[PDB]
Design a protein around this motif. Structure first.
Motif, mmCIF file in Angstrom:
data_model
loop_
_atom_site.group_PDB
_atom_site.id
_atom_site.type_symbol
_atom_site.label_atom_id
_atom_site.label_comp_id
_atom_site.label_asym_id
_atom_site.label_seq_id
_atom_site.Cartn_x
_atom_site.Cartn_y
_atom_site.Cartn_z
ATOM 1 N N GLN A 115 -8.986 -2.805 -5.829
ATOM 2 C CA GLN A 115 -7.794 -2.403 -5.356
ATOM 3 C C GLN A 115 -6.751 -2.885 -6.264
ATOM 4 O OE1 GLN A 115 -8.338 -3.954 -1.459
ATOM 5 N NE2 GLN A 115 -8.925 -6.124 -2.146
ATOM 6 N N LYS A 116 -6.600 -3.730 -6.979
ATOM 7 C CA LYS A 116 -5.846 -4.083 -7.882
ATOM 8 C C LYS A 116 -6.072 -3.772 -9.260
ATOM 9 C CE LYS A 116 -4.739 -6.125 -4.194
ATOM 10 N NZ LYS A 116 -4.291 -5.151 -3.330
ATOM 11 N N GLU A 117 -7.064 -3.866 -10.059
ATOM 12 C CA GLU A 117 -7.179 -3.801 -11.164
ATOM 13 C C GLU A 117 -7.484 -2.337 -11.834
ATOM 14 O OE1 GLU A 117 -10.474 -6.418 -13.266
ATOM 15 O OE2 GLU A 117 -9.267 -6.131 -15.218
ATOM 16 N N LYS A 118 -8.584 -1.788 -11.395
ATOM 17 C CA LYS A 118 -8.802 -0.565 -11.715
ATOM 18 C C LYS A 118 -7.983 0.591 -11.062
ATOM 19 C CE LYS A 118 -11.618 1.658 -8.117
ATOM 20 N NZ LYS A 118 -11.537 2.728 -7.639
ATOM 21 N N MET A 119 -7.415 0.255 -10.115
ATOM 22 C CA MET A 119 -6.718 1.394 -9.296
ATOM 23 C C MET A 119 -5.194 0.822 -9.712
ATOM 24 S SD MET A 119 -6.467 2.807 -5.657
ATOM 25 C CE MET A 119 -6.802 1.214 -5.059
ATOM 26 N N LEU A 120 -4.246 1.297 -10.358
ATOM 27 C CA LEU A 120 -3.123 0.597 -10.743
ATOM 28 C C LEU A 120 -2.048 0.819 -9.443
ATOM 29 C CD1 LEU A 120 -4.298 1.327 -13.679
ATOM 30 C CD2 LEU A 120 -1.803 1.227 -14.525
ATOM 31 N N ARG A 121 -1.720 -0.165 -8.885
ATOM 32 C CA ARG A 121 -0.972 -0.345 -7.979
ATOM 33 C C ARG A 121 0.579 -0.231 -8.283
ATOM 34 N NH1 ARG A 121 -1.474 -5.169 -3.923
ATOM 35 N NH2 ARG A 121 -0.018 -3.751 -2.675
ATOM 36 N N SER A 122 1.319 0.877 -7.698
ATOM 37 C CA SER A 122 2.686 1.027 -8.121
ATOM 38 C C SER A 122 3.499 0.018 -6.971
ATOM 39 C CB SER A 122 3.189 2.426 -7.874
ATOM 40 O OG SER A 122 2.933 2.880 -6.438
ATOM 41 N N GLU A 123 4.366 -0.534 -7.427
ATOM 42 C CA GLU A 123 5.336 -1.301 -6.644
ATOM 43 C C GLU A 123 6.570 -0.607 -5.998
ATOM 44 O OE1 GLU A 123 6.319 -5.397 -8.141
ATOM 45 O OE2 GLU A 123 4.286 -5.649 -8.963
#
Lengths: 123, 111
Positions: A115-123
RNA sequence: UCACCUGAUGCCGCGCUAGUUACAUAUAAAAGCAUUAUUUAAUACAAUGACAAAGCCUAGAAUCAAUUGUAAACGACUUUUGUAACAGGCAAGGUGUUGUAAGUGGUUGAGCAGCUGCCAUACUGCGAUCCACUGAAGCUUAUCCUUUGCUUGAUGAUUCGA
RNA sequence: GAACCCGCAGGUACGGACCAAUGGCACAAUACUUGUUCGAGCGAACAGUGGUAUGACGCUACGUCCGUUGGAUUAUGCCUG
RNA sequence: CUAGUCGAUAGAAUAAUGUAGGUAAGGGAAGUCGGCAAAUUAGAUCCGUAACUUCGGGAUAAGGAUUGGCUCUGAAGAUUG
RNA sequence: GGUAUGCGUAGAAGUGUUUGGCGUAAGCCUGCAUGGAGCUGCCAUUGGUACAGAUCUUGGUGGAUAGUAGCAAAUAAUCGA
RNA sequence: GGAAGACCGAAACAGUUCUGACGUGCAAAUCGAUUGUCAGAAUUGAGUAUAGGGGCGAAAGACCAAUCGAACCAUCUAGUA
């Protein structure tokens, strides 16, 4: 609570029953100097004091007497009080400072990476 | 500002003292001097001097005579330095002809 | 305030989608192999609140106390407060209310006494009441009407945010 | 003998209120007043309100002013069938 | 007056009901068990007095008049005649 | 009375308890906190032997009130020192 | 001329109607209005008699120490159901 029927001024205390107890406000007035004349031994300036913690209990009743109908007797007990007061300074209050317990191993960190690394979370 | 002033008042006293019975009118009419003073004065310890008793308890309890002429003398407390300092002095001025006897203040501060 | 049309500003031509075929990749596998288990949760959505972060907008009331009196067992309820239009104390006018004060003086009188004197026949010191000055006098807001007369007058405490 | 339908006048009881007038009760304010002290002259001084008569604010009844209109549908007559 | 006391918890406050002291225009027992609380009468002098009586009453019968304050005359005594 | 080379000021009896546990259950065992001088287990006996009760005895203590009931008869107290 | 168990009345006493005032009082019987005798069968302080199945009673079974158709106090009395 009653029967003290009304008086007006107690609306700052939001329920309309109040009194003005002459003897009960003598004995605390000297006592709150018998408190106020003890921090001056300790050299503390007394402006920065506020009332901390105050209760009042009961004590060993007397027995005076009354005389009544058909020949008989009933007590007339006036029951005294102990007044205890502690005066602190303008201090703080605290909630807590807390910590948490993890225990990480082989197959729990990757879901965070899913959920954090491989899928780049937009802030 | 000086407020040591000394006025020559006048009074209706029976009008102050309906809705009380007789037998308390009128030793009510000297604890309703102690509202009649300070509504014109503000100050507190209205020391009612013993000259005023021998005209108020003159007829007896049943009627104070309806018109007195009291001298309001706000005189300073010389000593007993309590937080109050200005109190009022009253006396008795026995004038008797009451039509158009005007109330005022022209009174030298040492009578 | 809000959706629609229009006056009309302007020029996104920023980003459209479908069907056929080719290409450049990156990513993607938790032996767990009869695996799930207090089933994550990111994304995204909104809800948020907190922290230093983000510009803007903003300049009061209530509450008793003290009043007053249209209210009243208390509380509540109607109001009030300009260096003073008013509040508030007084006086003054008016309204009424008993009936005509005290003060003098009086032809005011049942008379009786003192001198009734020598003449003037008098003064009264006595006199219950009546008459004048007199519809006088005192009472009148305390739960009245009247102010251009007269004086007094602000400087308190206590609670409350979308 | 239709107090028929109705209109008019009124009246009973309760009902809701107010007070201008009138009735009550009393500003125990004031006038005449006995008894006693205040020496005599003012009072109403005290008799737990002396008694008497008139008596305004109020409060009140015995007085006063008031108290009503829409919609279904029983009993029922008829309507058509 | 003479002697002595303010000693009955207090300053305050005009709600009921109660607690005791009252007056209330009409009629006046209808009220209620019943004229019971409560009102009139009350002192003294002047008459004026009914039936029944054991002739001492009933007798204050009932039924009435009269009654201030102020100003006066008329009367009831004692010593020295 | 026999008994366990029984524990005991290096804390014994009861008192509390949001420590822990055994029974079907009465009841113990146990930790901590008071506390200051004595106590229990097996097996023989046994006495004035276990309490919710008796309009139960005695001693604290409630709500109502711990501020309600009411301290209202005898004229009535008052300013200034 | 002032006699009577004569009358209206006051401290002395009594205790009637209000069935009024409190009925956890002022009280284990009183206060406040009212009413009766009031120069004798009157009212009363002290002394002394009278005794538990009896004293005494102008007679109600009243009264005998807040008890009275039998007290009052310890027992045979933990009397019986």
């Amino acid at each position: 609570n009653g029967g003290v029927g009304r008086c007006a001024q107690a609306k700052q205390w939001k329920t309309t029953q109040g009194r003005w107890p002459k003897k009960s406000a003598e004995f605390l007035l000297q006592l709150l100097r018998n408190a106020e004349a003890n921090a001056d031994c300790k050299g503390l300036d007394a402006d920065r004091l506020v009332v901390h913690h105050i209760q009042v209990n009961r004590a060993q009743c007397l027995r005076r007497r009354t005389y009544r109908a058909h020949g008989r007797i009933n007590p007339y007990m006036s029951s005294p009080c102990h007044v205890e007061v502690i005066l602190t300074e303008k201090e703080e209050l605290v909630s807590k400072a807390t910590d948490d317990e993890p225990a990480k191993k082989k197959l729990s960190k990757k879901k965070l990476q899913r959920q954090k690394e491989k899928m780049l979370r937009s802030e | 500002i000086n407020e040591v002033v000394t006025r020559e008042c006048t009074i209706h006293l029976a009008k102050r003292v309906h809705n009380i019975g007789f037998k308390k009118r009128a030793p009510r009419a000297i604890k309703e001097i102690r509202k009649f003073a300070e509504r014109e004065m503000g100050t507190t310890d209205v020391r009612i001097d013993t000259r005023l008793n021998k005209h108020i308890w003159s007829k007896g309890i049943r009627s104070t005579p309806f018109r007195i002429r009291v001298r309001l003398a706000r005189r300073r407390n010389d000593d007993e330095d309590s937080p109050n300092k200005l109190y009022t002095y009253v006396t008795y001025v026995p004038v008797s002809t009451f039509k158009n006897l005007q109330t005022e203040n022209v009174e030298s501060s040492d009578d």
